[PDB]
Amino acid sequence: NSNICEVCNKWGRLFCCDTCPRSFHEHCHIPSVEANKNPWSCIFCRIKTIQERCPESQSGHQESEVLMRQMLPEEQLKCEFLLLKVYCDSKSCFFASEPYYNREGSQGPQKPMWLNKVKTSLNEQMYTRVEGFVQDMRLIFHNHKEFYREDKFTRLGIQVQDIFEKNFRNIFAIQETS
């Protein structure tokens, strides 16, 4: 197995996957690494199994159909994985914890949102459709763009949104377009 966490790239107290060489901090994995389970298979492995059991699941889909799906176990897992792919980027640090807003010439968002809030919401099964999760995720970046205006710091929101959107299209097999 790897000697660093797949998500944050640090050593520490690592739980190792039994079916692939990845390792994780307990709360870096999503869901948090399960108490028992021998063998244990990481989220990457679990997602790969879904694809292998249903190869046609990789054919293209329309985003509008994906968003309306109910959060059954496989869609729950896919959203967890997509959240984890965002935390994999070090720039997610800016969006992880609860923000505050006090900048001359700007007003804070009406509905603040952050990664850890989305993480809790998934853990608590608060989303009934994929659309709930995707809307909160996109809101993170939209709030940031609006608040930071013409400051160059706005670019961090564009960057992390691009990671989110690329991974959304991959994990949910969105039909490729020009």
Instruction: Report the distance separating Cα 67 and Cα 62, nearest Å.
Output: 9
Quote the least distance from Cβ 5 to Zn ion, whole Å: 3
8 contributes a contact to Zn ion by CB under 5 A:
yes
Q: How far is the CB of 10 from Zn ion (least distance, A)?
A: 6
Can you tell me which residue has the tokens 């459709």? 129
Residue type at position 61: H
Q: Is 145 helix (H, G, I), strand (E, B) or coil?
A: helix
Does a cis peptide bond (omega within 30 degrees of 0) precede residue 99? no
Angle at 128 between CA 63 and CA 163, to 5 degrees: 45
When binding is defined by CB under 5 A, the residue of 14, 15, 23, 28 that contacts Zn ion is 28
Residue 113 binds Zn ion, judged by CB under 5 A: no
User: Cα 1 to the chain's mean position, in Å?
Assistant: 23
Q: How many residues belong to the site for Zn ion (CB under 5 A)?
A: 12
Per-residue x/- track, 36-55, Zn ion (CB under 5 A): ------x-xx--------x-
Nearer to Zn ion, 20 or 139 (CB): 20
Q: Which residues bind Zn ion (CB under 5 A)?
A: 5, 7-8, 17, 20, 22, 25, 28, 42, 44-45, 54
